C-alpha cells in the first residue's frame with residue numbers, strides 16, 4: 001500500500017491522474033520524483049522549470065555543480081540528484097525533444113531509467129514542450145516501465161484524451 005491518492009490504474013504497474021506533479025510531490029514526498037530534464041540540466045520551462053521554481057532554484061544550483069563535474073547527460077539518459085523539498089530523490093530523465101529534431105526512438109531508452117526505482121512519481125516523458133505525441137509516450141511508458149509508476153498529468157484536456165484513447 002502507498003499514499004498516492006485517486007490514481008486510475010491503467011495496468012498492473014502504471015497509474016495516472018490529472019494533477020500538478022509539484023503538488024503531488026509536496027503532498028506525498030515520494031522516494032523518487034522524475035524531472036523532464038534536458039542534457040544540460042537547464043530547468044527553464046515545463047516540468048523542469050516548474051519543479052525548479054518549487055525548490056526556490058536549489059535544484060538548478062545543484063544541477064549546475066553536477067554538470068560542471070560530469071558534463072552533459074545523454075538523450076535517453078538520467079542522473080539521480082536530491083529531491084530537495086519535493087521528494088527524497090529527483091531522477092532527471094532526458095527524453096528526446098522533437099522541437100530539437102531528436103529521435104523519438106530514444107523515448108524507450110528514456111523510460112528504461114524508471115526501472116531502476118521500485119516506485120516513482122513521474123510526468124509523461126517528451127510531452128508538452130518536448131513536442132512528442134503524449135498518447136505515444138503513454139504507450140511507450142506502459143510497454144517499457146515494469147516498476148510502479150504514478151503519472152501526474154498537468155493539462156486536463158490532455159488527461160481526458162489519454163484516458164479516452166488508452167488501449
Ligand SMILES: O=C(N[C@H]1c2cccc(O)c2C[C@H]1C(=O)O)c1ccc(NCC2CC2)nc1
Nearest residue numbers: 036046047050124125126127128129153154155
Ligand atoms: O509543463 C508541464 N507539463 C507538461 C510537460 C512539459 C514538459 C515535458 C513533459 O513531459 C510534460 C508533461 C506535460 C503535462 O503534464 O501536461 C507542467 C506540469 C506541472 C506544472 N506545475 C506548476 C503549475 C503552476 C501550477 N507546470 C508545468
